[PDB]
């Protein structure tokens, strides 16, 4: 019905405030400092009481209407992604045969070199985006740490890393070696 | 379908399916067999009281079977009750008497064998002895127009059948031979119903009169005018005392001796 | 070791056969203009028709018969497995519905060449095509019915084994829900993973071994075999029975360990029902866990097949245990050697 404004009370704590100019938002945090460009939705923020944010969003009769909620969720991903982070604790539940996974270093990209993958001798150099540390197993058998500081730089690559061993004939029940996400938890245990 | 209901429980004991067309009539015989006439042009015998399974399919009639009659039909309708009006003291006696009455009517050559007659729009009637055999005893031809209704006498000796042709025709019930025509009706004869005494048959016709005919003599016993319009239905009481009628005129007329 | 199954490819019933629909569609479709002259644009659709013809033609009605033997081949046991699936009913309905749609192609080709007549008025052609489509429809309807049954049992034959009666075969059967986890599984490597199995509580655990250079292997159907045919108005029990009827060396299984006081007294007078049927069949009794046998039912059960009392030809019995791994090789060996000195020695 063509709404004039759809302001949303965004709760933003101190110490992790953002910079507002045009359509660019700054991510301020001790744990890594990254940026983000937004040129497809055209948003505008307004400061009135530091924490809360009250603005005016027009066009409410198509697909816009509440185009603040779709941004507010992205804002929280930059606040809880620099403080709480996003540690995707993925567990490698597989039998068959002990796969020798050795991640090497190359031009600071860390290409995951998978040797002998269920009888395959193909080296799948999966590209890894910067901003996330990847470890191995320490106390728990088969566990990879995907602790990053972003969403479109960690979860985006994880989706391509999972669907990189797609087989024409075989699928998922051929062997219980499918790489699935156990629990999408966070870095901070308390939060 | 013909559905068999347990009266007390309102439960469906069996759903007799198999008929391709509408089931226009059903009679339930003394043997525990259900006989039906249907639009599929079949006459069927079912072991109803029993399994609810279809024993026989008789395809014989050329067109829809609208009405059927048992040689036992009247006796079974009444049960134990007859002209005397005596009702037995206990339930066992009531059943035994009813069975006794059934046997008298049904026995040919001393053995129970219920006979069945069916009528089709084809003007054809087939006389069947289903217990004895699938083959029809005879085919009864002769009507100019449709046979709307057919009835055996309570004793099952003779059959009077009401036909559209303005005659009600008499046939020997056992063999199916043609005895005679009861002319007298000017118009189509819709139904016939026999007396408890088995001497007479009452008909109601389009000509708006009821006619009681002494079948034995084959002469018209009594003509009972009175209805303004067509008389659709006739019935003769179990006690024999009254004949009831109803029809297009909408008024019931009961007739007495 | 096979018969004449698991060779027929997939068969589209009715829902997966929507091809006829598609074809009729394009057909009624047409609408061409014909090049050359605009006054002689009446000559073409005849070719159109011949086409549709050939099409449905090849269609099917020959691939159905393939993969299926005969109603009267050699042994009835080969068709007994189908009795517990589609039943002689769908059976004949096998070759039955077979010849069914079979001649169906007959009527097909028939009306086919039939219309065939004329090669003028593409329109009339549309009507002809519509008629053909309708005809096709009135068929695969009831078709796909039993045809559904078809596809079913079709895939079906992938878990059901198939031995060969034209060679040596050692019938091995046991009773589940006792302790076959560390007894019967010591011979083979069968284990339930994905493939399910109804009827009994467990699945199909057929044992196998390769000693010297012989070949002894046979499946088992527990349940139906452990009860008379009269008791089972069908099912597979009877399955168990025919199963038996097959064989060369039937090996009966017993258990005198008393798991919960399940002794045998009623099934004693049951072995005589299959006793005269064993004209050239060797018998063998294997009792599991023979050490905790208490003298309370020992002086009564021994008068069965253990001692020379009733319904016993005079064979050799074995009392040991393969669960504790006590001479498991000797037990397996002394259960098929008799067959070597019988049917093999004579023939």
């Amino acid at each position: 019905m063509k709404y004039i404004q759809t302001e949303q009370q965004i709760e933003v704590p101190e110490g992790v405030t953002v910079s507002i100019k045009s359509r660019i938002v700054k991510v301020v945090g001790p744990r890594g400092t990254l940026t983000k460009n937004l040129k497809h939705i055209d948003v505008t923020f307004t400061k009135v009481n530091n924490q809360l944010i009250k603005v005016a969003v027009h066009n409410g009769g198509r697909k816009h209407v509440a185009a603040l909620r779709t941004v507010k969720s992205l804002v929280d991903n930059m606040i809880t992604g620099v403080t709480k982070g996003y540690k995707y604790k993925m567990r490698y539940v597989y039998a068959h045969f002990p796969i020798n996974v050795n991640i090497v270093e190359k031009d600071g990209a860390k290409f995951i070199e998978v040797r002998n993958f269920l009888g395959d001798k193909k080296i799948r150099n999966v590209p890894v985006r910067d901003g996330v540390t990847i470890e191995f197993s320490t106390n728990v058998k088969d566990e990879i740490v995907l602790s990053g500081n972003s969403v479109e730089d960690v979860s985006q690559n994880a989706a391509d890393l999972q669907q990189i061993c797609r087989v024409r004939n075989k699928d998922i029940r051929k062997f219980l070696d499918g790489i699935y996400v156990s629990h999408k938890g966070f870095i901070t245990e308390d939060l | 379908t013909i559905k068999i209901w347990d009266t007390v429980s309102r439960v469906c004991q069996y759903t007799m399916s198999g008929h391709t067309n509408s089931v226009s009539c059903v009679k339930w015989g003394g043997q525990g067999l259900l006989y039906s006439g249907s639009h599929d042009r079949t006459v069927r015998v079912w072991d109803i009281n029993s399994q609810g399974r279809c024993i026989n399919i008789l395809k014989s009639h050329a067109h829809w079977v609208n009405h059927l009659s048992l040689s036992t039909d009247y006796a079974l309708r009444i049960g134990a009750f007859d002209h005397t009006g005596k009702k037995p003291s206990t339930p066992e006696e009531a059943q035994k008497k009813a069975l006794e009455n059934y046997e008298k009517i049904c026995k040919k050559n001393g053995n129970s064998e219920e006979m069945m007659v069916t009528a089709s729009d084809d003007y054809t009637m087939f006389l069947w002895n289903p217990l004895k055999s699938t083959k029809p005893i005879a085919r009864m031809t002769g009507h100019q127009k449709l046979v709307n209704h057919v009835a055996f006498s309570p004793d099952g000796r003779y059959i009077v059948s009401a036909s559209f042709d303005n005659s009600i025709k008499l046939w020997d019930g056992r063999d199916g031979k043609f005895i005679s025509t009861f002319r007298g009706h000017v118009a189509s004869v819709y139904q016939v119903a026999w007396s408890s005494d088995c001497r007479l048959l009452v008909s109601c016709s389009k000509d708006t009169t009821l006619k009681v005919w002494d079948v034995r003599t084959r002469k018209l016993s009594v003509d009972l005018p009175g209805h303004k319009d067509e008389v659709y239905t006739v019935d003769w009481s179990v006690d024999g005392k009254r004949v009831c009628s109803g029809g297009k005129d909408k008024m019931v007329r009961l007739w007495t001796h | 070791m096979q018969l004449s199954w698991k060779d027929i490819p997939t068969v589209a019933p009715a829902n997966d056969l929507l091809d006829i629909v598609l074809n009729r569609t394009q057909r009624k479709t047409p609408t061409v203009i014909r090049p050359g002259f605009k006054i002689t644009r009446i000559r073409a659709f005849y070719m159109r028709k011949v086409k549709y013809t050939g099409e449905g033609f090849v269609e099917k009605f020959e691939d159905i018969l393939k993969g299926f033997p005969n109603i009267n081949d050699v042994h009835p046991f080969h068709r007994d497995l189908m009795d517990t699936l589609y039943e002689k009913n769908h059976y004949k309905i096998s070759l039955a519905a077979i010849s069914r749609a079979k001649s169906l192609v007959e009527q097909v080709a028939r009306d086919y060449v039939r219309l065939l007549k004329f090669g003028q008025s593409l329109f009339q052609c549309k009507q002809l095509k519509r008629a053909a489509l309708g005809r096709m429809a009135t068929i695969v309807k009831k078709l796909r019915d039993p045809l559904a049954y078809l596809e079913q049992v079709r895939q079906h034959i992938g878990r059901l084994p198939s031995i060969d009666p034209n060679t040596r075969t050692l019938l091995i059967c046991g009773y589940p829900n006792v302790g076959k986890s560390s007894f019967l599984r010591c011979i083979t490597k069968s284990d339930v993973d994905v493939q399910p199995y109804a009827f009994t509580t467990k699945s199909l655990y057929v044992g196998h071994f390769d000693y010297k250079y012989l070949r002894f292997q046979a499946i088992d159907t527990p349940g139906i075999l452990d009860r008379p045919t009269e008791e089972m108005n069908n099912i597979e029990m009877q399955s168990i029975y025919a199963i038996a009827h097959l064989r060369s060396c039937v090996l009966y299984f017993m258990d005198l360990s008393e798991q919960c006081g399940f002794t045998i007294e009623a099934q004693v007078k049951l072995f005589h029902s299959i006793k005269p049927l064993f004209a050239n069949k060797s018998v063998m009794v294997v009792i599991n866990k023979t050490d905790i046998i208490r003298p309370e039912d020992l002086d009564e059960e021994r008068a069965q097949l253990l001692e020379s009392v009733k319904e016993v030809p005079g064979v050799e019995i074995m009392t040991s245990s393969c669960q504790l791994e006590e001479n498991v090789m000797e037990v397996r060996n002394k259960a098929c050697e008799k067959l070597l000195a019988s049917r093999i020695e004579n023939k």
Partner: protein
């Protein structure tokens, strides 16, 4: 739907009682209400309770009762009774029952986790009496219960017996769900009612935990 129901029983009581319930259930709740032939418990609402009583000073019918309806903003309910105070108060302090209760609560006792093949009986019961888990509940533990499991030839097992529940510990939405799979009661449901109200006395008296 039913709209009115409380007004059906207005002038038939005199000693209306209000009961406070913690962990509400059903098989252990109808062990008292079904026993008495004049004590109907009303648990669920909070504003319909004072329909025939009143919540204000202009919509009431009795004196000193509108102030009681304001304290009915919790998990408490009324009781359709009219018996003596002493004969119903002592009965409340004699009924105990242990159950699973509600999660997000520091529950006592310590439950150990067995290593190897999982079961569905308990922890104090030996593995020689337990029953193996059937092949059905598998993806419900790889996301909801987030427990690291390891299947071994069909049968699903685990790796390390990591304890997740003990004395004085609260979780989230799987605290009282992992105990239901086995069959071990956590907290103990104790009857802790509130106060009451008398029509003849027109006074109130806070009892038990309601005492301020």
């Amino acid at each position: 739907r039913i709209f009115d129901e409380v007004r059906e029983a207005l002038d038939t009581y005199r000693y209306v009682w209000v009961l406070h319930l913690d962990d509400v259930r059903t098989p252990v709740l109808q062990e008292i209400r079904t026993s008495w032939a004049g004590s109907k418990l009303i648990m669920g609402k909070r504003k319909v309770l004072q329909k025939a009583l009143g919540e204000k000073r202009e919509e009431e019918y009795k004196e000193n009762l509108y102030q009681l309806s304001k304290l009915c903003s919790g998990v408490t309910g009324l009781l359709f009774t009219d018996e003596d105070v002493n004969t119903v108060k002592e009965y409340f302090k004699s009924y105990v029952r242990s159950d699973y209760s509600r999660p997000n609560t520091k529950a006592p006792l310590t439950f150990t986790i067995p290593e190897g093949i999982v079961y569905s009986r308990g922890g104090q019961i030996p593995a020689e009496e337990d029953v193996p888990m059937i092949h059905s509940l598998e993806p419900t533990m790889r996301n909801k219960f987030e427990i690291p499991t390891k299947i071994k030839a069909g049968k699903i097992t685990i790796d390390s017996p990591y304890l997740v529940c003990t004395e004085g510990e609260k979780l989230d939405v799987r605290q009282a769900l992992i105990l239901k799979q086995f069959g071990i009661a956590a907290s103990e449901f104790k009857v802790k009612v509130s106060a009451y109200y008398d029509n003849d006395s027109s006074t109130v008296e806070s009892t038990n935990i309601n005492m301020e």
